[PDB]
Symmetry: C3
Subunit: 353 residues, 3 copies
């Protein structure tokens, strides 16, 4: 161990940068990312595939399979001229008998950048701390930062009418999942008005609100209540996730229904209560009938699928940022490069067995 302290963020490096949570990024930095991500989107949307990552190898570590997340990366890489390497849940070990210190050190010699969908957050940062190459947090038990950004992009693309974002209201209904926390962590970052409404039992905790509070002391934001049918009012965006528990204390079936199926379900009535043109968001996958009725999710005001596409939109740009940044800081000697190339040419042109 470092014998220090370290909780939830990684030690920074002077020569590389990670993406473990948005707590390490400023409002302006996130703005940069959204613009970059979106400029790239518009290029690819129109047939130009920016080869910003030619020949670069990304290692993907999953401890819990996630198709949406996997294909998003695997694809983002291809479009930009690179490759995504899938180390299936078992394929890897991460902490199986070989210390993360070891795994991190050797992975740094074999790929150009790292992403990991880890079970316990602690180990995603352990990885970010011990690797010499950029590390991205696919999602932990704590937050989902690659989603915070996908959703930021989505909201930007959908402001309706001279609301400037800083004055939009984003409301999250249901369980305090990491998706939930992340949404608050990002909206407050951007100086918006956030609110998590949800059952006395399943609200974001004081230790979490502590972080949200800190955010607004800097941006001009806000948060929270418990009494539904009132905090949804005037919402510009209504966001929900699923009711299952914590992939360990989960699936009580009719027990989920017990706690949430009074209110907490996003139906047309709930939608209307919020606003005439309140757009609906869901990180998917959605159990239709539970946290949201079909008429809403398949409705004219649903953007959950644009949002879905934007999961890629944002990882596309996030990869570019981290790599570009890594190259400054670690820039190639154009001379050494030129010689290395000639040396190789000559060898190939002249030697054989």
């Amino acid at each position: 161990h470092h014998h220090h302290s370290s909780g939830l963020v990684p030690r920074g490096s002077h020569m590389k940068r990670d993406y473990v949570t948005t707590e390490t990024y400023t409002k302006e930095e996130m703005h940069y990312l959204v613009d970059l991500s979106l400029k790239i989107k518009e290029a690819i949307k129109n047939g130009y595939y920016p080869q910003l990552l030619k020949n670069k190898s990304l290692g993907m570590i999953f401890q819990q399979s996630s198709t949406r997340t996997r294909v998003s990366f695997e694809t983002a890489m291809e479009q930009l001229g690179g490759h995504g390497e899938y180390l299936a849940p078992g394929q890897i070990q991460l902490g199986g008998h070989e210390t993360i210190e070891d795994t991190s050190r050797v992975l740094s010699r074999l790929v150009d950048i790292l992403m990991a969908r880890v079970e316990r957050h602690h180990s995603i940062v352990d990885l970010a701390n011990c690797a010499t190459i950029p590390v991205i947090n696919g999602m932990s038990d704590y937050n989902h930062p690659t989603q915070e950004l996908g959703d930021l992009c989505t909201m930007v693309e959908h402001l309706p009418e001279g609301k400037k974002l800083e004055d939009c209201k984003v409301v999250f209904v249901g369980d305090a999942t990491q998706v939930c926390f992340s949404l608050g962590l990002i909206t407050t970052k951007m100086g918006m008005n956030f609110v998590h409404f949800g059952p006395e039992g399943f609200q974001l905790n004081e230790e979490h609100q502590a972080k949200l509070a800190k955010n607004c002391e800097v941006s001009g934001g806000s948060f929270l209540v418990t009494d539904d049918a009132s905090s949804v009012e005037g919402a510009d965006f209504l966001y929900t996730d699923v009711w299952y528990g914590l992939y360990e204390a989960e699936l009580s079936e009719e027990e989920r229904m017990k706690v949430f199926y009074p209110k907490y379900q996003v139906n047309q009535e709930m939608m209307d209560r919020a606003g005439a043109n309140c757009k609906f968001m869901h990180c998917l996958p959605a159990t239709r009938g539970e946290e949201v009725t079909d008429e809403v999710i398949d409705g004219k005001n649903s953007i959950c699928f644009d949002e879905a596409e934007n999961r890629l939109t944002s990882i596309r740009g996030l990869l570019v940022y981290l790599m570009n940044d890594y190259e400054a800081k670690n820039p190639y000697d154009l001379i050494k490069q030129a010689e290395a190339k000639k040396e190789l040419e000559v060898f190939l042109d002249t030697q054989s067995i």
Copy 2:
């Protein structure tokens, strides 16, 4: 809608299939000779398997690489086929084209119907259309002597597997002479022959019998698959032998009975000793491995077609594209954090 799928060859005309064979083969000849046509640069294909299939996987994964693309493998469990409506809708935003080796055919078409991107049927419980085409290419490459195809005889021996049905579905499409011979219990059913019949009412084809050692005669191509059942009533070891090991096994005698230069075909994998003896499959008249290579030959071209087709219909604004590119350049050249 503005796109096209490949779920069964029932939706394709003889001429369209001809196109495909030609395209597939022209591409084959280029790659055979060191030119790799980058027709799919940067395009992402999502591969959904519900039953692992290495031959089918590596075929696609490879086809994509050669054409400048990538194949993404969603392992049997990795995926899910969340209502298909949802899965289809969001997959359409993350890849350029889709292929799926599905257990129940119904769901492969549900996918094709709900996706906005082209969908390809890796193989269902019903048919195997990406094999119909691989095999067409193979037969074309092997006509011997002023037979023009439309007048070749293709004979399938054994169980009425989807491979079997597909073979009939394609040979009749092209106006050839098809025949499935096989045990009273395991012949293509009337609902299936109905389809075959319909094909010939348009092409000039033919089909079927039960009595072996006679329908093989004059065959130009002798084709078989394996005797196991339907991956669920995965038939009995010595019970398979019970029904098929009288005749129904392709041995030299059976081969000779068919024709002097009747070529042998098998979609593989082959249980040697059962549906075919080694002297046949490893024989001078076996093309089962060219056929194998052609599994790729055809998906190579199939992918190109669907994509090209998708681009017409959904063509890029060269202007919007040019600006989008400049915009990006400027941003990268001037902005940082």
Copy 3:
């Protein structure tokens, strides 16, 4: 004979290995500095694992990408090497679907069966017998680390512990290069006479050496100290405190052991390492540890190995530039003029 495989370094001469090291390293330096030699454009490599191995998988998968190619992963179950479909069959059809083949096989016999029946080059990811793609990664590593007017042919490489295939391979390659090899290890776990027979044969050609049992003396004057793990043969995977029983007297690489060897004896481990067992942390994380460079070189070497085998395959099987040119025009015209 119109293609070449890489199953063991017993088929390669010292000079050939030298070629490989040079090629591998020239490529390394190019990539190290931002030039990605596209020597394998559009080429497809099929990777067959029967026992998952992330380090080996991502090494290949990556090597291919850098060189303009692709690595296809046939997971342990995905494939079947000898599953109801004879290797003869599997080999024949794999040869029509990829450009080159690698396989981490359980039983060596089947890796060679594959090499024999495939028409495309075959690489041995690692069998129960040897680990040839590691022999080369480690050769590169030692070259990059000679300290001081020792020329390699006169370096001493010492392997401590169990006679694993990694062990055998190390001796197989160091003797190949005319170096001084030694495996020290417990009376029960030394390289056998059938194996030393091969090592001997190597030195009758290169000027090498090998072996003892008494530790704290054969380590002396070592330029490289190398170890692997104490588990058994992925089947008699030993015993927890039974491994310790046999090896935890000596046979553990600690600073004392390191010092005993030499002032600047560099430490090597093919990884993964069970820290505390075959090596203490102060050693593996020490100033004289190169085990991580060595790790990077696993790729450094497969990078070049793939290039050699493919280049070699193209000589021998060269494209008709004319046929190629026409094929291309034919295709263009078809695409420019035909539709449905």
